[PDB]
Symmetry: C3
Amino acid sequence: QSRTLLAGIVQQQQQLLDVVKRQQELLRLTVWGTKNLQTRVTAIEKYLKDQAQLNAWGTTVPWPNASLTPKWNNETWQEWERKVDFLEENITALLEEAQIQQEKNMYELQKLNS
Amino acid sequence: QSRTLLAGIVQQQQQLLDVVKRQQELLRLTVWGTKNLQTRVTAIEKYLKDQAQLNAWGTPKWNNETWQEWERKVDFLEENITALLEEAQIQQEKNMYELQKL
Amino acid sequence: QSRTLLAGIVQQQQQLLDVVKRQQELLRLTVWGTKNLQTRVTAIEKYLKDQAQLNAWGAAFRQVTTVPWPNASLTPKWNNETWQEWERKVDFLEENITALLEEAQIQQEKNMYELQKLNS
Ligand SMILES: [Cl-]
Ligand SMILES: [Cl-]
Ligand SMILES: [Cl-]
Ligand SMILES: [Hg+2]
Ligand SMILES: [Hg+2]
């Protein structure tokens, strides 16, 4: 009498798991893009600071940022990398455990009538 | 009877809730990084325009407003999802008690 | 009499679906931002390379002071192809997740239907 609902609940759990797995894939691609851009923006900032210094040796608009800025940005994003890489590893683990629990639940649903 | 499957369903809901909490922390970090890059690219664009004008002597609006909108939206959603997650956790605790009664 | 629990579980599935739908909206906005930045950084890279080459040329010939743009010749094409692929993948995922969310919504309604009948 409740079997139908139970089956649909277990089914919905698979559906939600599928959604969050595919959301994790899209999040990973977004994280990749962010990393790729960070390296390219840092290169541009480095380039422009080098060109400003060369000009200075020679007017030419002083590269405004502070001396310390490259170090700071490097340290901040290294922290960012460590946090994001940990979260990606943890979510992968949690997703794997959810898949196992999904299988356990299906097994139990199948054992249900007999 | 169906108790064991039920236990397993309740547990998988906590597992799903845990994934989405972690995914929100990852998404917040990614949003931070987007913001940080947006500010740095804006700075670079401004610098290059300044330099161009100086050189020639011898866009920003639009972008700012569009990113203002983006910020409002992002910010709304971050708040909203945090509250939804906390509600989910509370309902999770209720479902665990009810299973308990079982 | 597992009813209250079952209603609690169906309600929590609703809450989880609501969370993942809002998380997708946040993800879509983040993707948008990533794309906007990619377009602008690519524009900057192109401008700087062009400027560097034009200045190198004029200093050689002066025909109506710059640090050479260091990247390899082929980098912009490689960048473009890599992000075209990124885009293709992001687009697949956005279509797929939207489809999975609609399926989830359908199954939530079927579950609610069944919950309303078993207790009645
Ligand atoms: Cl700098
Ligand atoms: Cl987009
Ligand atoms: Cl290049
Ligand atoms: Hg940490
Ligand atoms: Hg718990």
